[PDB]
Amino acid sequence: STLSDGIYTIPFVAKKANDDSNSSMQNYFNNPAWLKVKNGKKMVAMTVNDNKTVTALKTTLAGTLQDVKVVSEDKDANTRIVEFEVEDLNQPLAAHVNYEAPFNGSVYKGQADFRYVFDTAK
Amino acid sequence: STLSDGIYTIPFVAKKANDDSNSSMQNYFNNPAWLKVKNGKKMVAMTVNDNKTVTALKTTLAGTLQDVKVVSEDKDANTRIVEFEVEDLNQPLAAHVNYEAPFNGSVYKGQADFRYVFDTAK
Amino acid sequence: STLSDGIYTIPFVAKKANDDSNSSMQNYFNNPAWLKVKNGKKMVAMTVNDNKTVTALKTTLAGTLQDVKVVSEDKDANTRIVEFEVEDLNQPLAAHVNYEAPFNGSVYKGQADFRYVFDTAK
Numbered sequence: 001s002t003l004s005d006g007i008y009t010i011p012f013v014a015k016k017a018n019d020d021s022n023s024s025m026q027n028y029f030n031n032p033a034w035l036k037v038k039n040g041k042k043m044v045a046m047t048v049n050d051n052k053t054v055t056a057l058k059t060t061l062a063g064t065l066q067d068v069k070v071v072s073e074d075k076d077a078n079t080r081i082v083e084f085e086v087e088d089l090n091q092p093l094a095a096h097v098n099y100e101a102p103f104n105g106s107v108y109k110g111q112a113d114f115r116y117v118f119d120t121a122k
Numbered sequence: 123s124t125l126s127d128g129i130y131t132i133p134f135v136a137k138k139a140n141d142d143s144n145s146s147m148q149n150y151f152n153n154p155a156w157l158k159v160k161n162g163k164k165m166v167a168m169t170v171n172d173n174k175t176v177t178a179l180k181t182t183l184a185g186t187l188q189d190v191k192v193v194s195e196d197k198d199a200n201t202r203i204v205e206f207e208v209e210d211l212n213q214p215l216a217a218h219v220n221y222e223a224p225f226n227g228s229v230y231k232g233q234a235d236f237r238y239v240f241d242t243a244k
Numbered sequence: 245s246t247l248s249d250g251i252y253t254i255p256f257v258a259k260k261a262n263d264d265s266n267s268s269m270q271n272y273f274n275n276p277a278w279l280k281v282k283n284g285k286k287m288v289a290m291t292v293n294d295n296k297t298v299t300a301l302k303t304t305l306a307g308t309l310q311d312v313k314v315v316s317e318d319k320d321a322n323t324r325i326v327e328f329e330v331e332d333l334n335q336p337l338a339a340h341v342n343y344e345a346p347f348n349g350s351v352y353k354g355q356a357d358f359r360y361v362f363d364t365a366k
Binding site: 005006007009011030031032034036038043045047071072074076077079081122 | 268271320321322345346347348349351352353354
């Protein structure tokens with residue numbers, strides 16, 4: 001947690017919920033994540049690269065999963081910037097994502113559980 | 123082929139035409155591909171992440187290469203969703219792509235052959 | 245340097261300034277880069293996939309770093325096509341990038357040094 005004030009680019013990997021392997025959900029988020037070290041608060045910002053498909057995202061805060069906040073949304077470029085706090089950048093951050101298939105059919109909804117594994121701030 | 127009804131995310135890799143190595147053409151397609159298991163028909167959908175550059179794409183169906191169908195096109199975000207049927211998700215699916223360089227010159231056209239190698243549905 | 249006339253797709257990796265490891269800045273540029281072999285001039289074109297964040301980019305030419313030229317800019321899709329000459333496609337091309345965080349705060353600016361390592365034209 002010992003980090004000085006400023007803007008740093010923090011890398012991440014999305015791993016499967018109960019497997020130490022890469023999750024297919026990783027491709028919905030732009031790497032690296034932005035890190036603002038302000039007033040001793042670890043704020044992580046990341047571009048959700050498919051606004052239409054990814055409908056909801058929740059990240060663990062104080063022991064429970066809470067819906068992420070939208071910094072700014074770009075409906076023309078099909079992207080959005082999301083903001084969330086992390087308790088520890090050393091523990092695999094459990095996250096649940098709700099998605100929608102672009103198919104022209106009755107069934108299209110989906111949802112998956114995955115873990116965000118953060119490297120070191122730069 | 124033994125798969126139940128529903129929406130599943132199928133991963134893929136683009137390999138070189140006559141080499142078991144990754145093809146540079148992989149970066150024109152968004153991973154993973156969407157899979158709709160409806161009425162015993164293996165339908166694969168994928169985002170072509172550069173609408174202007176990638177001009178044509180054909181995938182092998184019943185022994186011959188046929189031009190892929192457009193689900194929906196996004197001219198503002200420079201993307202499009204394409205749909206194609208696969209005979210077997212265990213054989214390397216041969217595909218031919220036609221592309222155009224964004225350079226301001228007389229010569230800009232190009233075309234390449236590659237293989238889609240599908241993993242398992244999720 | 246012995247290459248015939250035409251359009252070829254050249255792959256690249258962004259490595260850390262003083263480390264032979266991948267740079268986080270790699271995700272701001274679309275792979276592969278376009279190569280036009282016209283009148284014995286090695287011209288490299290690449291899509292900067294985040295127009296708003298990446299504010300400036302300079303590539304080494306004749307021993308010094310010079311600001312890259314804009315082929316065409318897409319403000320709707322948040323992209324731009326940049327053009328620059330390379331002295332040798334065998335030496336790690338030193339580059340300096342200026343970036344801006346999308347956070348809603350006083351501090352957001354940043355800048356990093358990295359090297360472009362080019363493979364072979366296709």
